């Protein structure tokens, strides 16, 4: 479900995509991301909340 696809301002979640596989994952792991940037390029990034 993505808010941006439909009501971006509202923040309401509307399904935009479906996964064909019937099996549903029982576990989820966030993948850590590090920006590859020089000291001047370094910038703050918005937090992600689960």
């Amino acid at each position, epitope marked *: 479900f993505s808010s941006r696809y439909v009501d971006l301002y509202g923040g309401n979640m509307f399904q935009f995509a479906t996964l064909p596989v019937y099996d549903t994952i029982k576990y989820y792991s966030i993948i850590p991301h590090s920006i*590859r*940037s*020089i000291q001047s390029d370094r910038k703050a990034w918005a937090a992600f909340y689960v």
Partner: antibody
Amino acid sequence: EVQLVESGGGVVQPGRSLRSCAASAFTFSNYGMHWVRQAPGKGLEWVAVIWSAGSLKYYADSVKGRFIISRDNSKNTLYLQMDSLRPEDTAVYYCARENTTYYYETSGSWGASYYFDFWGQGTLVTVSS
Amino acid sequence: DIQMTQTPASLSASVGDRVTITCRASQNISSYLNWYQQKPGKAPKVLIYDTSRLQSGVPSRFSGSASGTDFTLTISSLQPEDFATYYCQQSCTTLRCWTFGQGTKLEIKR
């Protein structure tokens, strides 16, 4: 301050099993330990290479299972097993960790990321007749 | 695997004279090529790791330049203590071949 030593080296008969290397003042689990054999008049080659996990063991093409590597990270010691020993096989064995230079060149950005310090002194095994 | 033969089995170098040692691989399989100097009774020391950046603790006079498969190491003002047997090994994750150096020994000219 890191100490690397090889133990269990001794004169042996042909077709014999000889058990190695030990690391002191260092964390064995973080760095993979690799055994290198040097023969006089010849270049050093890594007969046995062991990953830090120890799940994957790498054997040189020259040795057909002659060298078997088992490492105890908690013990901080790497055990090398030698079988079907031969006069030609006789050589000095050095154990040292090996590292490579991995980096992303966003702006010609390169990191050496190398540790070759505390290279093993080496041990000599011989066949006597 | 890879078959590597150094062009000179032994090299004679006079003190204060520039000399070149060339090791030729069967092919340049990987970008990283390591040249090492070995002293008997002493642990091996790598002169260069990839032939593009000099290893720390190695004299600036040593230079590694590779043309085609062959790799040439240049020594300037060579000294008896500086002189050592040289082994070149192709460096890649896909080792196992464990290619090694034939060994070139430098002797003072007198």
